[PDB]
Design a protein around this nucleic acid. Structure first.
Ligand SMILES: [Zn+2]
Length: 252
DNA sequence: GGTAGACCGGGAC
DNA sequence: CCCGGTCTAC
């Protein structure tokens, strides 16, 4: 799920779990548990705690309990569902939180690629994976100024810059390519080569792209197809180690 | 500062 | 073997 999808999950999941008390935690793929390192300690500490809230940072979900916070990343295919303990689990279910009311919060993932960390609430923000995470792209904390500061300091491509979680929180490959197209900037451009004008334009399109989604693609996955703005075939290459889609006419 | 390795497996070769 | 995100290793 991309950032906007994670925000939707946050919004819809909260009322389904708030006020419920954990009676058990079942783990079928321990590797998902990253902290505590021992999945048995992870399970034990959550028992008896009530869900008090649910927040999002980047693509991370932060479940707020009595004493602890559970930090969860779904990666690309992870999913949460709330359902009865009486019904069979869906395929690829790796972690289940059982509540005292007979309902469960279940985590699935065919790719088995997601992560979970639990810390005392007061510690969560200074520990992995939230430590060092950049500002929310929709927050004033993410400004053209902040972006310009990071761009000049580096010799990396602009795409590499935007993919950096310390620069801005949870901006995925898709939204990076879409934003750069909308800003008219080639993804391979050195970040330091961007003018002040281009930086402002880029920040503006980043906010608009992610903002609209939170509330159809120009380039992502459209290689070989005509650009929707100029009709030039969209091309795909590799930049910053990712599939990279762009219009060679619209972007400079 | 920066990269590479690490984790995964459905679908492509 | 590739690919996505984000971490530890170096
Ligand atoms: Zn174009």
């Amino acid at each position: 799920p991309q950032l906007p999808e994670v925000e939707t999950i946050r919004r819809t999941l909260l009322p389904l779990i708030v006020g419920k008390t954990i009676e058990d935690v079942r783990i079928f793929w321990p590797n998902i548990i990253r902290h505590p390192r021992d999945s048995e300690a992870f399970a034990a500490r959550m028992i008896g705690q009530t869900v008090r809230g649910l927040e999002r940072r980047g693509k991370f979900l932060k479940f707020l309990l009595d004493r602890d916070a559970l930090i969860s990343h779904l990666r690309m295919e992870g999913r949460y569902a709330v359902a009865s303990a009486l019904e069979p689990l869906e395929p690829h279910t790796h972690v289940v939180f059982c509540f005292t009311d007979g309902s469960e919060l279940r985590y699935r993932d065919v790719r088995k690629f997601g992560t979970m960390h639990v810390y005392a609430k007061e510690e969560a923000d200074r520990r992995p994976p939230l430590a060092e995470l950049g500002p929310e792209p929709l927050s004033p904390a993410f400004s053209p100024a902040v972006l310009a500061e990071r761009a000049v300091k580096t010799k990396r491509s602009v795409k590499a810059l935007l993919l950096d979680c310390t620069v801005v929180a949870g901006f995925g490959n898709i939204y990076v390519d879409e934003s750069l197209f909308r800003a008219g900037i080639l993804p391979g451009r050195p970040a330091a080569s961007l003018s002040s004008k281009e930086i402002e334009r880029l920040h503006e399109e980043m906010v608009a792209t992610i903002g609209e989604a939170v509330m159809h693609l120009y380039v992502y996955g459209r290689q070989g197809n005509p650009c929707k703005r100029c009709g030039t075939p969209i091309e795909k290459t590799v930049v910053a180690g990712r599939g990279t889609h762009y219009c060679p006419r619209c972007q400079r």
